[PDB]
Design a protein around this ligand. Sequence first.
Ligand SMILES: [Mg+2]
Ligand SMILES: [Mg+2]
Lengths: 73, 145, 52, 64, 189, 146, 143, 67, 57, 55
Amino acid sequence: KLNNLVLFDKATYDKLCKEVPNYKLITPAVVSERLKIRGSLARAALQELLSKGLIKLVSKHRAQVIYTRNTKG
Amino acid sequence: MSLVIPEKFQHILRVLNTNIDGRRKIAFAITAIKGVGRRYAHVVLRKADIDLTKRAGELTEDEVERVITIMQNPRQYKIPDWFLNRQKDVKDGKYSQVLANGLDNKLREDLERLKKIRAHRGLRHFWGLRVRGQHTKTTGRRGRT
Amino acid sequence: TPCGEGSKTWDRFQMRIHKRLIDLHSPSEIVKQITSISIEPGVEVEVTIADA
Amino acid sequence: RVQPIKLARVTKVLGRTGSQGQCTQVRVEFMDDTSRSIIRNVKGPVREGDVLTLLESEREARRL
Amino acid sequence: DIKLFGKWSTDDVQINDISLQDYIAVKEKYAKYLPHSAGRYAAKRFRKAQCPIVERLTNSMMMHGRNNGKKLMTVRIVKHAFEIIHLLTGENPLQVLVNAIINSGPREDSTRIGRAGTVRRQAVDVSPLRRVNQAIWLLCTGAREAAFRNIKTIAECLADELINAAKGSSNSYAIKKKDELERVAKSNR
Amino acid sequence: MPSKGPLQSVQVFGRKKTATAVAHCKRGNGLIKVNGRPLEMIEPRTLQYKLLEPVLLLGKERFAGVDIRVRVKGGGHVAQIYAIRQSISKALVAYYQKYVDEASKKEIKDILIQYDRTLLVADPRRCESKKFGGPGARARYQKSYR
Amino acid sequence: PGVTVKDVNQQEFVRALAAFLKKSGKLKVPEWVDTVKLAKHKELAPYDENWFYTRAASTARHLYLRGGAGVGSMTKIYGGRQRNGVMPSHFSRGSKSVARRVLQALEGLKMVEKDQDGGRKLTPQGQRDLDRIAGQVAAANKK
Amino acid sequence: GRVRTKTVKKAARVIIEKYYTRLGNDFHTNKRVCEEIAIIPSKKLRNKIAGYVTHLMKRIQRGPVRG
Amino acid sequence: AVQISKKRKFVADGIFKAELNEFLTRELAEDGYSGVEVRVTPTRTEIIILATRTQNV
Amino acid sequence: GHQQLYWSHPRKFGQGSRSCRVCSNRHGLIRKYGLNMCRQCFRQYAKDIGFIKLD
RNA sequence: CCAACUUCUUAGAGGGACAAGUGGCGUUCAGCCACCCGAGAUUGAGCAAUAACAGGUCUGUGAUGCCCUUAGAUGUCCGGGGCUGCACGCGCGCUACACUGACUGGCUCAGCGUGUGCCUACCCUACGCCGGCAGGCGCGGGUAACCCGUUGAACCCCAUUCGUGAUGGGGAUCGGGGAUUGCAAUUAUUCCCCAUGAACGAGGAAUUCCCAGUAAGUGCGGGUCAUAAGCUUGCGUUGAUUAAG
Ligand SMILES: [Mg+2]
Ligand SMILES: [Mg+2]
């Protein structure tokens, strides 16, 4: 119910790049409570997963950046 | 860029007498030092030629040594004169930023100076009163009993 | 109120003064008899210097 | 015991009631016949001729 | 045909209850591009019912003073939230919004200025505008009190409470508390 | 160069609360801009669909013979887009009562009246002055008794 | 086609011209540039470390739309809302000697001239290349 | 709030009693007649009298009013 | 020399008017005063009293 | 007496040197537009100046 | 005349709305409820009776009765101090408790109004050049729809950083320095800088104000003003949730 962690270990980063580009709603507020990171690396790492091409960008607003799962078939 | 971490990451650092937090970033991690405020911290770092967006436990000891060195004697690193704590100090006539137990040293020293020669400011520090001419009839109740 | 007692009332005096502007290319001598047509207390007329 | 949550259209509104001007008597009709018509009360503003749905249909009217 | 916020047209949407078609205004006569207009709705009564529900949701969202006239700031709360809604579901968000209005509007409550049996005693019915008023009030409130101390945005907390209230699971605030109105109305029936 | 048809044009205003905005519109070929800059390059951009809105439910290509341009003066950020939304709406309505038939003007006024009448009526509500005993016009200072 | 400055997005036209002046290193940047706080209605230093180029890009563009702007006028347009702590917030003026130094630095860059009256306009050499890069940034809106 | 004070009704009755041969059930002509034939100190009570004049046109064309 | 603003022109001759009203009240009260009336020209100004007993003034 | 310091405290700036031009109080006076009358009986002469209220 | 005109702006006149028109109710009375047309189908305020109150004010007034005091004067002036003193209680208010936010930067919108004085010294400020800031000088304009001023107001809008932590929320307290007003700043005038970083997690009983450009948010200007607004009186801006009993 208190402090999270910045700067990923090995155990959450492979958990990131195996299922976080799979599900449909993906947002820095989501993966800073479904994971055990706090945010501002939610914003940092999910920016570069848009830089790779594992997900799609939709909204891009300053209060709210919203991604989605990528084209499957 | 830090996708996982490098090999060593201080949980806490250790700077003057303060163990600054290791998960903050340096612009707001060294503000735990009494004497390094929210404004002085950015200026020391910009004179330290660093990248501001790096976090706390991922500075090497050469970075930590050079950050402490610039905030220790800032008068020679081209930091201007009315940016410092002790501008024209009342015992020596010099200019210094004070950052330690020496901050609280020179804090009480002027308190006991005024208490010695019995100035009106020093008498209200010797009492539990307000100093900067505030009213006392209705405010500040929870200092006294 | 002349004193402080009462129920916090306010009177809003105001004075709305009107002003109009007229040009002439007249010879500047007959403006004296233009001034000399009517006494008319409530107005205030002013004649510009004739030097343009 | 188990009632269908039955909806009902209103005829003439019978003016305010409820000691604060909060409740309105409305005289509903039960959407299936106009012969069956109970007088009831709602809160909130009405607009004569609309449709409102009774969670349980017959309890009481306002009389002492 | 008019595509509220540029997309999500309003022909496939169907209001299920007969009791609320004359009070929910999703149809083509009252469908716009974005919910912001020179209103004039509490001049004469009963014209807050042909005000469209996207406008009536974005008016009831800026509430507590520090956000009290910020209407260009709550219109994007709803603009983003429809896209979060569309991705978790795949449905037209106006359809799932009016399912939330149907299912969060109560049917019974009680009224008494005397001898508080619980609080109010004599259980009454409800007109089909006050259940629309209390639909939008419960939804905007629960989206607010569940995002006050949270990393979660108001846009996601709005979106995932009314798709949680349109299904109906007592996990959204507008369902778990509306039942307590209908429990306490049966308790002094 | 004035060689053909000098000044076949009108200049038509629209208002909200202080914000006036007068649309000068000539004969030409499909150009719409406000204070110099285009309609899609406009400041708020959250209200984007309600200032290019007469263009939508009338038609860009159909109504592309006019070269509307607007100057705006006074108001706020929201009132200055309702003022141009009113202005360019009733500009080409007023451009049609002067140069083509009113059968066509009623043909577009049919669109611009059943769709939220405020595009060519000036919304009359205004500032409504403060009074001398409260923080505003209606509200009052807090009364105490004990 | 012919695209002027007025039909381009101008939040990022400023980003275009700031990147232009940063790479064309002919701007007389002051020595005190990293400890400035920018106009005492705010309590932190500017976040962008090369902030002097985006202030220069901005004050050239506002000078394009308004002739006769002086150092008093530029501080009335970069001012903001000073929070007074426990007292209510108010408007306050910008910083004068960041406005004076940036107009003098653009005059070394030959993109601003003085006037018959007081104030400053920009020279035709000045406007011809912020129209040239305005065409580039409207083309880079596609590109 | 429509209810018309005694000076509106009394002065409109002395028109219709005395100038009935000039009046009709048009508002905008009776407004011009009452302007010309009465002395009315302001415009608002002028057409507030003239409206009650047109009301009594449809009233005394039916039957014996106090007429 | 230099002249003053039109806003304080009008309050100055209004307060000129109010001052000699009060003095000519205090003088001519026993002699049927009943006010004054002023006319300013760019010459001799002319103030007419409105006394009821014009013999006693 | 001894004229060097009879009236020597400097009546300049400050409300000990403003006064009413009618009525000779130093409190509440209105120095707007050069009126310099007392608050309490500006209201007397307010019509003699020509300041009507709203009607 | 090396052009016309008044839409926008400012006034002045006149017009315009009357419950007029159409249904429905009502004694087919007074009138009410709906619509259509229309900018508007109740704009907002001022004045405001009869008779009173032992209401307040002699500290506003050369309004004033009576009493008191009048030179070791309750007159008046000068200097210092006080009206700001604090175990506490109450009333107006301001800023907050954050992420619907705080930063840092871009970006664009106002209106009401005020300005150099008879005594009375001192006004509003453009521009230029010094200063990291408040500020300092030189140089103009303005007795004002002529200049400040197209009053580039804040909120809001767009990106950046921050991540639910009494935190980059909050900024009380307090040390040291720097300027300005002034005859004089101590018991800090105000402003600036650096540092210090307190309670405070939405508030019990109770209680206030308000129903449309309203509440509320948000700044601006008059008053006081040598220096000065958390007050007051006005102005615009953004703009509603509830109700027609
Ligand atoms: Mg007195
Ligand atoms: Mg938070």
